[PDB]
Design an enzyme around this catalytic site. Structure first.
Site, PDB file in Angstrom:
ATOM      1  N   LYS A  52       0.779  -1.218   0.000  1.00 14.76           N
ATOM      2  CA  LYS A  52       0.000   0.000   0.000  1.00 14.76           C
ATOM      3  C   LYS A  52       0.811   1.270   0.000  1.00 14.76           C
ATOM      4  O   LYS A  52       0.442   2.264  -0.542  1.00 14.76           O
ATOM      5  CB  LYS A  52      -1.157   0.025   0.979  1.00 14.76           C
ATOM      6  CG  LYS A  52      -1.702   1.430   1.034  1.00 14.76           C
ATOM      7  CD  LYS A  52      -3.209   1.552   1.116  1.00 14.76           C
ATOM      8  CE  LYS A  52      -3.653   2.934   0.606  1.00 14.76           C
ATOM      9  NZ  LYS A  52      -5.069   3.266   0.876  1.00 14.76           N
ATOM     10  N   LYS A  64      -6.711  -6.755  -1.870  1.00 16.23           N
ATOM     11  CA  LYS A  64      -6.564  -7.973  -2.643  1.00 16.23           C
ATOM     12  C   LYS A  64      -5.341  -8.727  -2.151  1.00 16.23           C
ATOM     13  O   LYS A  64      -5.362  -9.930  -1.904  1.00 16.23           O
ATOM     14  CB  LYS A  64      -6.811  -7.853  -4.157  1.00 16.23           C
ATOM     15  CG  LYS A  64      -8.306  -8.025  -4.489  1.00 16.23           C
ATOM     16  CD  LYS A  64      -8.848  -7.204  -5.666  1.00 16.23           C
ATOM     17  CE  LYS A  64      -9.521  -5.884  -5.274  1.00 16.23           C
ATOM     18  NZ  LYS A  64     -10.552  -5.387  -6.223  1.00 16.23           N
ATOM     19  N   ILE A  98      -9.746 -12.638 -34.199  1.00 15.92           N
ATOM     20  CA  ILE A  98     -10.676 -12.320 -33.156  1.00 15.92           C
ATOM     21  C   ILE A  98     -10.042 -11.700 -31.999  1.00 15.92           C
ATOM     22  O   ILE A  98      -9.212 -12.309 -31.383  1.00 15.92           O
ATOM     23  CB  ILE A  98     -11.379 -13.503 -32.533  1.00 15.92           C
ATOM     24  CG1 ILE A  98     -12.209 -14.279 -33.517  1.00 15.92           C
ATOM     25  CG2 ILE A  98     -12.286 -12.956 -31.455  1.00 15.92           C
ATOM     26  CD1 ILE A  98     -13.256 -15.108 -32.822  1.00 15.92           C
ATOM     27  N   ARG A 175      18.062 -15.610 -34.209  1.00 15.96           N
ATOM     28  CA  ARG A 175      18.834 -15.740 -32.935  1.00 15.96           C
ATOM     29  C   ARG A 175      19.176 -17.190 -32.514  1.00 15.96           C
ATOM     30  O   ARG A 175      19.612 -17.391 -31.387  1.00 15.96           O
ATOM     31  CB  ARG A 175      18.172 -15.088 -31.712  1.00 15.96           C
ATOM     32  CG  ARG A 175      18.113 -13.566 -31.664  1.00 15.96           C
ATOM     33  CD  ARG A 175      17.194 -13.202 -30.530  1.00 15.96           C
ATOM     34  NE  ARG A 175      16.015 -14.078 -30.471  1.00 15.96           N
ATOM     35  CZ  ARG A 175      14.961 -13.902 -29.648  1.00 15.96           C
ATOM     36  NH1 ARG A 175      14.890 -12.899 -28.782  1.00 15.96           N
ATOM     37  NH2 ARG A 175      13.932 -14.754 -29.685  1.00 15.96           N
ATOM     38  N   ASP A 182       6.069 -17.980 -35.947  1.00 10.77           N
ATOM     39  CA  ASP A 182       5.681 -17.599 -37.257  1.00 10.77           C
ATOM     40  C   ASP A 182       6.854 -17.065 -37.996  1.00 10.77           C
ATOM     41  O   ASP A 182       7.825 -16.663 -37.409  1.00 10.77           O
ATOM     42  CB  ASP A 182       4.606 -16.513 -37.181  1.00 10.77           C
ATOM     43  CG  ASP A 182       4.949 -15.236 -36.443  1.00 10.77           C
ATOM     44  OD1 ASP A 182       5.776 -15.144 -35.520  1.00 10.77           O
ATOM     45  OD2 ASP A 182       4.141 -14.244 -36.829  1.00 10.77           O
ATOM     46  N   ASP A 248       4.826 -13.299 -42.552  1.00 14.13           N
ATOM     47  CA  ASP A 248       4.720 -11.848 -42.747  1.00 14.13           C
ATOM     48  C   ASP A 248       5.918 -11.333 -43.454  1.00 14.13           C
ATOM     49  O   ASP A 248       7.042 -11.662 -43.170  1.00 14.13           O
ATOM     50  CB  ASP A 248       4.580 -10.963 -41.481  1.00 14.13           C
ATOM     51  CG  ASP A 248       3.428 -11.276 -40.518  1.00 14.13           C
ATOM     52  OD1 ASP A 248       2.568 -12.154 -40.699  1.00 14.13           O
ATOM     53  OD2 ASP A 248       3.475 -10.517 -39.430  1.00 14.13           O
TER      54      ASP A 248
HETATM   55 NA    NA Z   1      -7.181 -13.826 -31.606  1.00  8.69          NA
HETATM   56 NA    NA Z   2       0.275   4.582  -2.082  1.00  8.06          NA
END
Ligand code: NA
Ligand code: NA
Length: 327
Positions: A52, A64, A98, A175, A182, A248
DNA sequence: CATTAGA
DNA sequence: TCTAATG
């Protein structure tokens, strides 16, 4: 790096969920700066309040941290991880083409599964169609063994079309990587640079060649500088066909190749680090150029680069073979 | 962070 | 035109 683990991990889960499932750029943005800093923090966070005290961490996130630190779990986390709607978004999203936006929409319509996707092939655009088509193969890693094969082919035709063509397969494959995701090919030509108003055919010519022979089998997107598609290795003597792989190609002004090439070869770190170095060394480096730094704060003046070397030289470093561009 | 689809 | 999705 490990003392801060679950926390940043829990924190990253949360962010990711906001951004995707919900349209909460902010919360989503909260979680990450937070997870950013708590990870930087050098000591074992032992409580909320402790965390915090951090910049960006507030009451929300602290709370949390307690629960998580207290019990090895989180409710909101157990809840989300559970939720089908939300589960759905995560998955639909895997489909190249998507995103979240669409994923939400599909879902609201009832498209949840891969199959549902099929039954409604119509709602999907070309991209998403190929994505859905090659879903399995899209998810498969590429063997360097095959990488070598593909590279062999593309170079061949390229050369064939025009001999003045420069192509390089960038990425981890560059590398040494045992496998790749890909394939990225960087391309340029002497007659195309910073000023010389294009030559779109330059890209086109080669795409054409590639398909001509059947390497490219689909086209996700073709523009005058960047082609995005699908490729496949000639299924030899029957019994074993190759998977459809993403490919690509990008056209570049010959006068910006190496930086660009530098840059794509990475690694993400080797870059930064190298990049951080040129700074002291009196420079600036980006995906396309290298500018000597001026004292007044900033400065321009694109230095002339003919190899990966010209760059290294400039910042007076050691030429690092790609193999060891690891960091 | 820049390029392409799409509508 | 803007907005999405990839890298
Ligand atoms: Na996707
Ligand atoms: Na703070």
């Amino acid at each position: 790096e490990t003392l801060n683990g679950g926390i940043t991990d829990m924190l990253t889960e949360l962010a990711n969920f906001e951004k995707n499932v919900s349209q909460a750029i902010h919360k989503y943005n909260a979680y990450r700066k937070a997870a950013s800093v708590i990870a930087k923090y050098p000591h074992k966070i032992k409580s909320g309040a402790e965390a915090k005290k951090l910049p960006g961490v507030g009451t929300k996130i602290a709370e949390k941290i307690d629960e998580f630190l207290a019990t090895g779990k989180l409710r909101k986390l157990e809840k989300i991880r559970q939720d089908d709607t939300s589960s759905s978004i995560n998955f639909l999203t895997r489909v190249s083409g998507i995103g979240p936006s669409a994923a939400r929409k599909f879902v609201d319509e009832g498209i949840k599964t891969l199959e549902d996707l099929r039954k409604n092939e119509d709602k999907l655009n070309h991209h998403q169609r190929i994505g859905l088509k090659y879903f399995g193969d899209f998810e498969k890693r590429i063997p360097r063994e095959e990488m070598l094969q593909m590279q062999d082919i593309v170079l061949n035709e390229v050369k064939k079309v025009d001999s003045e063509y420069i192509a390089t397969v960038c990425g981890s494959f560059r590398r040494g990587a045992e496998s790749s995701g890909d394939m990225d090919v960087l391309l340029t030509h002497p007659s195309f640079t910073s000023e010389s108003t294009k030559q779109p055919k330059l890209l086109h010519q080669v795409v054409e060649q590639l398909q001509k022979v059947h390497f490219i089998t689909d086209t996700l997107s073709k523009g005058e500088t960047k082609f995005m598609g699908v490729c496949q290795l000639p299924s030899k003597n029957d019994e074993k066909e190759y998977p459809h792989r993403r490919i690509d190609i990008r056209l570049i002004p010959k006068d910006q190749y190496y930086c660009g090439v530098l840059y794509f070869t990475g690694s993400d770190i080797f870059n930064k680090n190298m990049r951080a170095h040129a700074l002291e060394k009196g420079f600036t480096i980006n995906e396309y150029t290298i500018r000597p730094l001026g004292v007044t704060g900033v400065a321009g003046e694109p230095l002339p680069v003919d190899s990966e070397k010209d760059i290294f030289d400039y910042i007076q470093w050691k030429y690092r073979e790609p193999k060891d561009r690891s960091e």
